[PDB]
DNA sequence: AGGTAGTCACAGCTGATTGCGCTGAGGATTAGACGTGCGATAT
DNA sequence: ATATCGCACGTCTATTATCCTCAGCGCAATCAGCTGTGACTACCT
């Protein structure tokens, strides 16, 4: 098995880490997100890719981590690289990320699910061994553009408004997380930092080549349980095999 | 007096049933005028 | 030598767009029914 998908629900404090709109500013959830990335950065080496819902949520996420004495712990393990809207600044950040994963220093690539870097690059083996989805990526309902499409599909194709948003959210989430497996010898780790993924309505939106590897045993396991699964998976995936 | 048929300590399965998670809308939560004050200046 | 203008130093008031608690429909917790294993207890002809 070249992939080990798993969905992480409540954290070590038995509190859900869902990226709900009403809980974006909650201090309990943001601590677990940093806590999840802390032990995760020390189990999967040479490349971790993390996608956030939006830049606005991304900048507020690191600010809370920086304010607490938690982000510095991640720094000494892996280098933190932040993807910005500027193409030139993104390119140099990706350039240093590639060489950081090339040697043993390691690095973390922080970006947005709905960004040009999510699909503009491919994470081949030894690059981005772990892909982390911090919550279900939902497109912003503002600008009165998506709702216009939702209304049109409502009375024309009988498309459920919730289903289309779920379909769009899971499509982008599954597309970016599926870029860590390029080649038969390639392997990677796939995680989901949201209890909303654990629901059947969103699991069924994952591609069939990931459904069979997503065992029902690990759908609501905590951060500590997820680390143990990651350690066991990576330990046995480094052994030599046959073509 | 002999044989067996319920019967209760668990366990499994099945078919349903109903019960809560999925967000989102209508109602309660410190810089200009106005003075002074002070210091450099007309009669 | 004493009132008078420039400069400064504040202070009161405001010509004007924020955060809480009630709604169907689908996936999951719940339950009645039935049966399987083992020994037990007893009862009629």
Curated annotation (Swiss-Prot):
Residues 1-150 are annotated as: Mediates interaction with MMS19. Interacts with GTF2H2/p44 via the C-terminus of this protein; mutations in the C-terminal region of XPD do not alter its helicase activity, but prevent its interaction with and helicase stimulation by GTF2H2/p44. It is linked to Xeroderma pigmentosum complementation group D: An autosomal recessive pigmentary skin disorder characterized by solar hypersensitivity of the skin, high predisposition for developing cancers on areas exposed to sunlight and, in some cases, neurological abnormalities. The skin develops marked freckling and other pigmentation abnormalities. Some XP-D patients present features of Cockayne syndrome, including cachectic dwarfism, pigmentary retinopathy, ataxia, decreased nerve conduction velocities. Trichothiodystrophy 1, photosensitive: A form of trichothiodystrophy, an autosomal recessive disease characterized by sulfur-deficient brittle hair and multisystem variable abnormalities. The spectrum of clinical features varies from mild disease with only hair involvement to severe disease with cutaneous, neurologic and profound developmental defects. Ichthyosis, intellectual and developmental disabilities, decreased fertility, abnormal characteristics at birth, ocular abnormalities, short stature, and infections are common manifestations. A motif (Nuclear localization signal) lies at residues 195-208. Belongs to the helicase family. RAD3/XPD subfamily. The gene is ERCC2. ISGylated. Changing residue 115 to D: In XP-D; combined with features of Cockayne syndrome. This is General transcription and DNA repair factor IIH helicase subunit XPD. It is found in: Nucleus; Cytoplasm, Cytoskeleton, Spindle. Changing residue 188 to W: No longer interacts with GTF2H2/p44, has 5'-3' helicase activity. Changing residue 129 to P: In XP-D and TTD1. ATP-dependent 5'-3' DNA helicase. Component of the general transcription and DNA repair factor IIH (TFIIH) core complex, not absolutely essential for minimal transcription in vitro. Required for transcription-coupled nucleotide excision repair (NER) of damaged DNA; recognizes damaged bases. Sequestered in chromatin on UV-damaged DNA. When complexed to CDK-activating kinase (CAK), involved in transcription by RNA polymerase II. In NER, TFIIH acts by opening DNA around the lesion to allow the excision of the damaged oligonucleotide and its replacement by a new DNA fragment. Component of the 7-subunit TFIIH core complex composed of XPB/ERCC3, XPD/ERCC2, GTF2H1, GTF2H2, GTF2H3, GTF2H4 and GTF2H5, which is active in NER. The core complex associates with the 3-subunit CDK-activating kinase (CAK) module composed of CCNH/cyclin H, CDK7 and MNAT1 to form the 10-subunit holoenzyme (holo-TFIIH) active in transcription. Interacts with GTF2H2 (p44) which stimulates the 5'-3' helicase activity of this subunit. Component of the MMXD complex, which includes CIAO1, ERCC2, CIAO2B, MMS19 and SLC25A5. Interacts with CIAO1 and CIAO2B; the interaction WITH CIAO2B is direct. (Microbial infection) Interacts with Epstein-Barr virus EBNA2.
